Amino acid sequence: MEKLRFPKDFIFGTATAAYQIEGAYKEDEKGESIWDRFSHIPGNVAKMHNGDIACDHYHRYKEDVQLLKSLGIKSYRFSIAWPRIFPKGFGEINQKGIQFYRDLIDELIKNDIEPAITIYHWDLPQKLQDIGGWANPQVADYYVDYANLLFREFGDRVKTWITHNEPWVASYLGYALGVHAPGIKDMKMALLAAHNILLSHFKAVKAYRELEQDGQIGITLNLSTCYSNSADEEDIAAAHRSDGWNNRWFLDAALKGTYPEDMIKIFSDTNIMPELPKELFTEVFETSDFLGINYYTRQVVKNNSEAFIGAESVAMDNPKTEMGWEIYPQGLYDLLTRIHRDYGNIDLYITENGAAFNDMVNRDGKVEDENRLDYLYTHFAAALSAIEAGVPLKGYYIWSFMDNFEWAEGYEKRFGIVHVNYKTQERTIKKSAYWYKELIERSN
Numbered sequence: 001m002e003k004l005r006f007p008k009d010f011i012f013g014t015a016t017a018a019y020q021i022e023g024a025y026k027e028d029e030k031g032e033s034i035w036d037r038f039s040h041i042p043g044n045v046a047k048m049h050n051g052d053i054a055c056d057h058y059h060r061y062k063e064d065v066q067l068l069k070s071l072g073i074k075s076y077r078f079s080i081a082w083p084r085i086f087p088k089g090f091g092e093i094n095q096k097g098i099q100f101y102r103d104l105i106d107e108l109i110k111n112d113i114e115p116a117i118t119i120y121h122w123d124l125p126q127k128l129q130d131i132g133g134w135a136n137p138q139v140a141d142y143y144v145d146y147a148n149l150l151f152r153e154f155g156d157r158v159k160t161w162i163t164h165n166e167p168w169v170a171s172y173l174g175y176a177l178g179v180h181a182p183g184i185k186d187m188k189m190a191l192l193a194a195h196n197i198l199l200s201h202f203k204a205v206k207a208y209r210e211l212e213q214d215g216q217i218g219i220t221l222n223l224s225t226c227y228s229n230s231a232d233e234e235d236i237a238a239a240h241r242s243d244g245w246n247n248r249w250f251l252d253a254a255l256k257g258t259y260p261e262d263m264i265k266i267f268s269d270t271n272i273m274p275e276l277p278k279e280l281f282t283e284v285f286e287t288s289d290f291l292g293i294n295y296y297t298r299q300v301v302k303n304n305s306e307a308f309i310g311a312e313s314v315a316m317d318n319p320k321t322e323m324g325w326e327i328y329p330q331g332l333y334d335l336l337t338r339i340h341r342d343y344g345n346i347d348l349y350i351t352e353n354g355a356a357f358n359d360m361v362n363r364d365g366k367v368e369d370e371n372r373l374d375y376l377y378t379h380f381a382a383a384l385s386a387i388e389a390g391v392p393l394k395g396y397y398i399w400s401f402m403d404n405f406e407w408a409e410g411y412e413k414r415f416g417i418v419h420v421n422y423k424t425q426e427r428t429i430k431k432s433a434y435w436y437k438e439l440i441e442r443s444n
Contacts, residue, residue: 011395013075017121020404024058028096031087038181049410079121089125116160134193140200159215205286220292225331229302238303257285292351298331329378336386352399
């Protein structure tokens with residue numbers, strides 16, 4: 001296969017989240033988060049794994065920054081842990097927490113790396129969950145105050161802001177399926193949580209615009225192209241319903257300021273739609289500067305009148321990752337072109353794309369992750385083709401910089417381009433990272 005080359009202004013990065021890599025879960029007066037709570041209760045996370053220590057990045061950040069530099073990576077997406085800054089969610093600011101992020105940001109900049117900051121990446125202070133979490137609109141108000149502080153402290157030096165990571169996952173897995181923190185199992189509440197999360201996004205965007213900083217702000221959505229299992233009208237409609245939940249609910253909300261009417265009807269007819277304020281987003285909608293896309297796989301769907309939204313995913317006979325997710329680079333091309341087709345010319349960033357594989361250090365000290373390299377080659381190829389088709393794709397962040405705590409899956413699923421030995425904390429750059437360094441260099 002021919003070597004891939006992107007335009008010189010394309011942004012190449014890698015991404016992480018605070019809970020997944022930082023550790024130091026109780027240091028410097030950091031408050032308890034919902035993930036600290038969830039992972040400390042048995043039955044929630046595989047093998048009782050937790051983020052207490054994770055990759056110890058809170059301590060090792062200087063060397064981890066040098067790892068990025070050594071790969072020629074010039075953009076780095078990370079999250080700021082709300083409870084390091086406001087241990088109780090609001091009120092008294094924790095200076096040690098702000099100082100950690102100031103030092104990290106200064107370290108990145110000194111080393112020619114542009115920070116992209118995710119403001120909320122699932123680590124709600126537990127004190128806020130004690131008052132309802134995202135079901136309570138008061139928590140959205142506290143979020144904006146927290147965002148305002150970050151803009152004030154860092155906005156002079158940070159030019160890309162992501163308000164929320166994967167609000168669909170946060171609401172659906174956290175409040176409907178009970179598989180992520182806070183572990184609630186109530187779809188009606190999840191839809192309310194999703195509403196308040198979107199409200200907090202638009203309000204943070206509104207606040208950001210007043211500052212006239214040199215930067216851009218947007219949301220990151222997990223998105224998964226849906227295909228019908230057959231050509232029967234039945235199955236095609238089922239795929240469009242799954243698309244409605246997976247993709248359109250948040251796409252329409254974030255990009256048009258409305259929820260898709262077909263899905264409202266479905267949720268209403270099954271009595272899972274919450275009573276939401278009458279105005280919805282009619283008075284608060286704010287256009288983002290970009291849309292962040294987290295893409296990993298597709299869904300193939302058949303009709304099942306007894307299933308949630310009458311849709312059932314079909315397990316496909318194709319190569320798949322250690323998550324069980326089908327490797328389907330065509331889905332990424334299809335998604336990028338679809339977003340440009342349906343929502344017009346808004347700048348796009350792939351804020352996450354990557355794969356979990358069973359990686360390990362070999363007899364020569366190397367981590368030869370050919371499966372990930374090949375995965376990345378095909379997905380970057382699809383992204384490049386979308387660019388050729390005119391999609392305004394401006395950058396691409398690999399998930400993840402290093403192997404980390406994969407939420408309810410624990411440490412068992414390795415997404416890094418850098419291997420982490422959890423017993424010794426040794427980092428070992430994987431083959432895929434070296435391939436990435438060459439891609440970035442070639443494109444520069």
